[model samples]
Target: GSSGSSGHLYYCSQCHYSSITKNCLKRHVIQKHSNIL
Candidate 1:
């Protein structure tokens, strides 16, 4: 599936979230996706 998407610098697997740096993405996933785990 093409999914009509583009690559990103730092992103989260659980959602369509992108960050400027590794730490930014990490914090986002930890905070937003914490309930899933």
Candidate 2:
């Protein structure tokens, strides 16, 4: 059984950055933590 636990709500590791969609979260993270990458 392949069970992938995907969080329905995307949240960031920094601050209170959160979004309903993963894409939105990704963009926010990129914008905020671009240097981290």
Candidate 3:
């Protein structure tokens, strides 16, 4: 199984920060991974 799934709240292993919510994953992506928001 995947370690995590989209639209589920989780912390970033690299930065150890919890996403505010499942939708916040997108923000996490932008902030931590440098992906488009």
TM-score of 1: 0.54
Query: Lowest summed-lDDT stretch of 10 residues in model 2?
Result: 1-10
Any residue pairs clashing in model 1, and if so which?
none
Alpha carbon lDDT of each predicted model: 0.67, 0.68, 0.62
Better lDDT candidate (1, 3): 1
Give all candidate RMSDs, comma-separated.
7.0, 4.3, 6.0
Clashing pairs in 3: none
lDDT (10s digit) by residue, model 1, range 1-37: 3332333466688998777655557888778878752
Ranking of all candidate structures by their TM-score, best first: 1, 2, 3
User: How big is the RMSD of model 2?
Assistant: 4.3
> Candidate 2 overall Cα lDDT vs. reference?
0.68
User: Which of 1 and 3 is the better model by TM-score?
Assistant: 1
Clash tally, candidates in order:
0, 0, 0
Predicted candidate 3 versus true structure: per-residue lDDT over 1-37, tens digit per residue: 3445544567775576776455656566566778443
Give the poorly placed runs of model 1, Cα more than 4 Å off.
1-8, 35-37
- Model 3: how far is 31 from its true place, Å? 2.2
